[PDB]
């Protein structure tokens, strides 16, 4: 049916002004969509920011603000802060129910950027014997915590390390007969690829 679309991820430095957008598939976001914005800090901490007509939740900082720029709902953080780094979901109201977006992962820069160290492992012999083949494309040492794996597949969610450079693993599942290949990681610019 109707589906809500957001930026996969955004980046901004402390003090700057970033803007997240929320797009409706059926058309332009109007006032009867009551565009809501929710923030998710790490460890499953949800809180509301904006919503309804033009009201906001108790305590929502003055830097946060809502608008209808162009033909979609916007959320503008004027003077981004360190703690402002989280995942932002926008929700649109369609007639009688809410529909959430994919969420935008806003990163407030703290450490210099880092390219993803990729390594693609083939399916070992034990798996081939099993008659099920599995591929592993491990991604280590990247920042911010946003990577996009592109090869049945199933990649894991970004998780920081000991050196504060989020890491993750990708799994492309096949069958031994289908086995009888390349993993490319696009990270905030260039694209590291290996066969």
């Amino acid at each position: 049916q109707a589906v809500v679309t957001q930026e996969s991820a955004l980046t901004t430095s402390p003090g700057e002004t970033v803007t997240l957008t929320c797009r409706s598939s059926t058309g332009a976001v109007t006032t009867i969509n009551f565009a809501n914005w929710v923030q998710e800090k790490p460890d499953h901490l949800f809180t509301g920011l904006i919503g309804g007509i033009n009201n906001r939740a108790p305590g929502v900082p003055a830097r946060f603000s809502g608008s209808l720029i162009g033909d979609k709902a916007a959320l503008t953080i004027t003077g981004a802060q360190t703690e402002d780094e989280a995942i932002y979901f926008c929700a649109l109201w369609y007639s009688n129910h809410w529909v959430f977006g994919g969420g935008t992962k806003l990163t407030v820069l703290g450490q210099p950027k880092s390219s993803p160290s990729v390594t693609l492992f083939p399916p070992s012999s034990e798996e081939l014997e099993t008659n099920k083949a599995t591929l592993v494309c491990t991604i280590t040492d990247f920042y911010p915590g946003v990577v996009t794996v592109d090869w049945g597949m199933e990649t894991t969610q970004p998780s920081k390390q000991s050196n504060n450079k989020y890491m993750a693993s990708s799994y492309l599942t096949l069958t031994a007969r289908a086995w009888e290949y390349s993993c490319q990681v696009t990270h905030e610019g260039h694209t590291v690829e290996k066969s």
Binding site: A2, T26, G27, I32, Y94, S95
Partner: peptide, 8 residues
């Protein structure tokens, strides 16, 4: 309505 939405 165009999207089946409510009459505003």
């Amino acid at each position: 309505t165009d999207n089946g939405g409510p009459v505003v």
